[PDB]
Design an enzyme around this catalytic site. Structure first.
Site, PDB file in Angstrom:
ATOM      1  N   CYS A 138     -18.978  30.150  35.283  1.00  0.00           N
ATOM      2  CA  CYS A 138     -19.410  30.027  33.900  1.00  0.00           C
ATOM      3  C   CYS A 138     -19.318  28.606  33.365  1.00  0.00           C
ATOM      4  O   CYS A 138     -20.167  28.186  32.577  1.00  0.00           O
ATOM      5  CB  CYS A 138     -18.583  30.934  32.979  1.00  0.00           C
ATOM      6  SG  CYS A 138     -18.634  32.692  33.356  1.00  0.00           S
ATOM      7  N   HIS A 142     -23.486  38.803  30.678  1.00  0.00           N
ATOM      8  CA  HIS A 142     -23.406  37.953  31.864  1.00  0.00           C
ATOM      9  C   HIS A 142     -23.135  38.818  33.077  1.00  0.00           C
ATOM     10  O   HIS A 142     -22.441  39.832  32.984  1.00  0.00           O
ATOM     11  CB  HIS A 142     -22.374  36.832  31.698  1.00  0.00           C
ATOM     12  CG  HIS A 142     -22.576  36.028  30.450  1.00  0.00           C
ATOM     13  ND1 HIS A 142     -21.570  35.275  29.878  1.00  0.00           N
ATOM     14  CD2 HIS A 142     -23.647  35.911  29.629  1.00  0.00           C
ATOM     15  CE1 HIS A 142     -22.016  34.737  28.752  1.00  0.00           C
ATOM     16  NE2 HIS A 142     -23.269  35.107  28.579  1.00  0.00           N
ATOM     17  N   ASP A 145     -24.217  29.762  30.698  1.00  0.00           N
ATOM     18  CA  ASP A 145     -24.756  30.639  29.671  1.00  0.00           C
ATOM     19  C   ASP A 145     -26.117  30.216  29.148  1.00  0.00           C
ATOM     20  O   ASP A 145     -26.928  31.058  28.795  1.00  0.00           O
ATOM     21  CB  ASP A 145     -23.807  30.696  28.473  1.00  0.00           C
ATOM     22  CG  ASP A 145     -22.530  31.454  28.765  1.00  0.00           C
ATOM     23  OD1 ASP A 145     -22.348  31.901  29.915  1.00  0.00           O
ATOM     24  OD2 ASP A 145     -21.714  31.619  27.828  1.00  0.00           O
ATOM     25  N   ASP A 183     -22.168  37.410  36.317  1.00  0.00           N
ATOM     26  CA  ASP A 183     -21.271  36.732  37.277  1.00  0.00           C
ATOM     27  C   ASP A 183     -19.786  37.087  37.418  1.00  0.00           C
ATOM     28  O   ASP A 183     -19.076  36.408  38.155  1.00  0.00           O
ATOM     29  CB  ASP A 183     -21.444  35.201  37.241  1.00  0.00           C
ATOM     30  CG  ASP A 183     -21.362  34.610  35.831  1.00  0.00           C
ATOM     31  OD1 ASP A 183     -21.454  35.351  34.829  1.00  0.00           O
ATOM     32  OD2 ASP A 183     -21.229  33.373  35.717  1.00  0.00           O
ATOM     33  N   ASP A 227     -29.237  35.284  27.863  1.00  0.00           N
ATOM     34  CA  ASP A 227     -28.299  34.227  28.217  1.00  0.00           C
ATOM     35  C   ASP A 227     -28.657  34.008  29.680  1.00  0.00           C
ATOM     36  O   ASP A 227     -28.967  34.965  30.389  1.00  0.00           O
ATOM     37  CB  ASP A 227     -26.853  34.683  28.080  1.00  0.00           C
ATOM     38  CG  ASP A 227     -26.330  34.574  26.653  1.00  0.00           C
ATOM     39  OD1 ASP A 227     -27.122  34.394  25.709  1.00  0.00           O
ATOM     40  OD2 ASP A 227     -25.109  34.673  26.469  1.00  0.00           O
TER      41      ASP A 227
END
Lengths: 360, 360
Positions: free
Chosen positions: A344, A240, A107, A242, A191
């Site tokens: 993450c 995010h 992050d 991913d 982020d």
């Protein structure tokens, strides 16, 4: 040259793995609300400022310790952030807040070549999250790595749409369709997990925490060696990239069936293989305070043919196996509650390989 | 119910603090030699039977008086052992000797629940050390506490390996690897400081002064309410466990970087947080007649968030502070010479709390 990583799949050599210790429920402000599933609003309302359930944190600690043991077994050097009490309240001239955690290195840190970059963040509770990684970063710097900190935002009220229809309405989709989220274009914010690497090309998504100004800052800072592309997906609550579009090899990507990419043909034309993973099997009664069930596809590649995948998610394990990719199964069911899977919880620092283009 | 303590961290209410008065250098016998750093052998050889440097003792007295003032300030009731002349020579049918001191309550007394237990000891010069604490113990007994004295050893020649390679060789490590030390298994013996409490689980180490028979006695005596576990570390001269593995909170332990625990994974699997403190900054020219520089991590918890730490050891102060633990700084540099830090110089008698399990 401890730092050197150009993509998400080259042979992994060094990685930073987060910590679950002293994680605190963030105060329930607008940007937090814009990410929380209605189901947890009461938890956030009552727990904000307090530690996440200690009994739960303890299971997460054990799971991550085991994950680190396996990483070492797999030949990877592991670094861990400094333990910090995230409950300390701080005050900038713009706002006051308690912290979150340092569970997710992905992050806040992204490695592009020999340069480690600290994202600015967009949550008030994550303003001072970089403090946990400085001991590690200074060591890499002393050893020759480049070190960059993107402009830290004021995070004043103007950065947030205090009147965002967070309260369920889903037309967030229309706003989302317009590139309109909880964060304004007041100042740059992002982020690092909203960026995913494939050598000379980096893909970014404008999300609840990553604005166009933030993406433009990355683009301008990395040019001309790297090209930063903006892609979008059918997703009313992005934060995010991913667990939506995870690149696992040169020209191979895992695409979340529920969040299709609007620019998928760009990749099909490049001759890329788009794989849609099977659905997660994680119980609906298990608390996922910070994300969706899609953590299953949030895998980490140790190399092109080795993937660290969740022990419980058999269907997706099978998928990798039919593809000839060896599965390293680790159970992080409780760590998942903090909001992340393998990708993450880590930040690849050094992968053995060179800078290449995979989009031709 | 003056006595009631189940661990090392619950809110402290009553404590016994040792005395430096009339401390005598113990005769230089095999068990003493097995603990002395070569550097001091000449001191022990010439000073045995005489008081420790009086000028030095006086500074220790002042330091401990101040420590008691701070304890009272922090709301803790303080008891002190009776002043005794430790130079008196005594004679049992098995040996003859002069005494040591009553500086370290932790070495001889351990509180488990509402029971105060007097350790047997293993040094000839500490045979009658219990005499200094009887006035205090009888008062607690009259007030309802349980009182136990483990079997006092004969300390005859058979308890010692008169041919231990004390003379530096370090393969003591191999013997140590075999669980082979200066004390045999002739009869039970132990210092209470070789045991550390975490509610229903107590951890013990076989050391130079604590044998397996002694540990088995504790295990048998405490069962079934408490479980006594044996753990070992990379340490060629163990005597006490609190400057090696100091438990400071529920599931939080300070582990000495130079003395790693062979069973560390047992704790990582329990979801415990293992913290390695920074190195001590105490000058090499300052006399530490009885221990190592690691007294820095021999802290005492007043409660989970308050730790009494050495004024001079800034690096470890910083560590606690980043963890959100308030540091109560006290200078005991000269008291350290007698062989202990805060945990050694005290014996927590009453901590507000209940009996729990922290190993799940």
């Amino acid at each position: 040259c401890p730092v050197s990583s150009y993509n998400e799949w080259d042979p992994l050599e060094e990685v930073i793995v987060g910590r679950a210790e002293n994680a605190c429920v963030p105060p329930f402000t607008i940007e937090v609300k814009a990410n929380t599933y209605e189901k947890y609003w009461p938890f956030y309302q009552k727990q904000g400022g307090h530690y996440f359930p200690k009994d739960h944190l303890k299971k997460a600690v054990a799971e991550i310790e085991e994950m680190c043991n396996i990483l070492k077994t797999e030949g990877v050097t592991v670094r861990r952030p400094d333990p910090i009490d995230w409950s300390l309240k701080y005050k900038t001239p713009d706002f006051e807040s308690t912290g979150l955690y340092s569970a997710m290195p992905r992050d806040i840190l992204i490695v592009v070549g020999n340069e480690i970059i600290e994202a600015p963040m967009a949550w008030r509770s994550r303003f001072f999250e970089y403090r946990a990684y400085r001991s590690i970063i200074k060591d890499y710097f002393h050893r020759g790595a480049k070190w960059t900190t993107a402009p830290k935002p004021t995070m004043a009220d103007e950065l947030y749409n205090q009147d965002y229809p967070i309260h369920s309405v889903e037309d967030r989709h229309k706003l989302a369709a317009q590139g309109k989220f909880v964060t304004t274009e007041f100042e740059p914010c992002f982020d690092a997990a909203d960026f995913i690497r494939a050598g000379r090309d980096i893909f970014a998504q404008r999300s609840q925490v990553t604005n166009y100004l933030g993406i433009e800052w990355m683009r301008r800072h990395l040019a001309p060696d790297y090209r930063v592309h903006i892609i979008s997906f059918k997703d009313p609550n992005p934060m995010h990239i991913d667990a939506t579009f995870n690149i696992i090899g040169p020209g191979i990507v895992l695409s979340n069936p529920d969040r299709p990419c609007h620019q998928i043909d760009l990749f099909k034309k490049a001759g890329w293989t788009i794989i849609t993973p099977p659905t997660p099997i994680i119980p609906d009664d298990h608390p996922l305070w910070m994300s969706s069930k899609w953590l299953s596809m949030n895998v980490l590649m140790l190399d092109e043919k080795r993937v660290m995948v969740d022990a419980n998610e058999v269907p997706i394990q099978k998928m990798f196996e039919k593809l000839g990719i060896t599965t390293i199964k680790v159970n992080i069911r409780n760590a998942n509650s903090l909001g992340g899977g393998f990708h993450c919880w880590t930040c690849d620092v050094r992968r053995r390989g060179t800078l290449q283009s995979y989009l031709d």
